[PDB]
Amino acid sequence: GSGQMFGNGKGSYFITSKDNETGITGIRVFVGPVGLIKSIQVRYGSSWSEKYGIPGGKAHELILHPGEHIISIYGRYRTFLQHVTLITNQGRSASFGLETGKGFFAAPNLTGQVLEGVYGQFWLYGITGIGFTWGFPR
Structure with missing residues (x-):
């Protein structure tokens, strides 16, 4: 779900x-x-x-x-x-958007876990902050 916070x-x-x-x-x-x-x-x-x-x-x-x-x-x-x-x-990769700015790498803490969710912050033109939740499949 989407939502807002109180604050400046x-x-x-x-x-x-x-x-x-x-x-x-x-x-x-x-x-x-x-x-x-x-x-x-x-x-x-x-x-x-x-x-x-x-x-x-x-x-x-x-x-x-x-x-x-x-x-x-x-x-x-x-x-x-x-x-x-x-x-x-x-072994597949899929690139989205323009490669500019500070780099980051996101990976689970436990080997075997996979992406099962995403959270973040958005404002004017797009997403301004992004995070990832990981977990074991099957």
């Missing part, structure tokens, strides 16, 4: 996670003409989630094969989330 800050906030049913089967990233990530959407089973971020841009998708999972995430950011490349347990 700016962003709105979201959290999405494995409902109870099937884990992540796909990922939708919306990128604008300037190359920043505006919003994301995650598919659980066959059901795509709520849109999380700022409306606009063009949809880009990584559709996961059955038994295929996200196991690590490399990215870049400035004020806004610029770039994300998702890497799978099957």
Whole structure:
């Protein structure tokens, strides 16, 4: 779900996670003409989630094969989330957005765990902060 906080800050906030049913089967990233990530959407089973971020841009998708999972995430950011490349347990990678800014690497604490959720902050043109929740599949 999406929501806001009290305080002098700016962003709105979201959290999405494995409902109870099937884990992540796909990922939708919306990128604008300037190359920043505006919003994301995650598919659980066959059901795509709520849109999380700022409306606009063009949809880009990584559709996961059955038994295929996200196991690590490399990215870049400035004020806004610029770039994300998702890497799978099957050796595939999918790059979204423009490669600019500080680099980061996201991976679970426990080997074997996979991506089953995402949380973050969004504000003006897109996502300004992003985090990842991990867990064991099957």
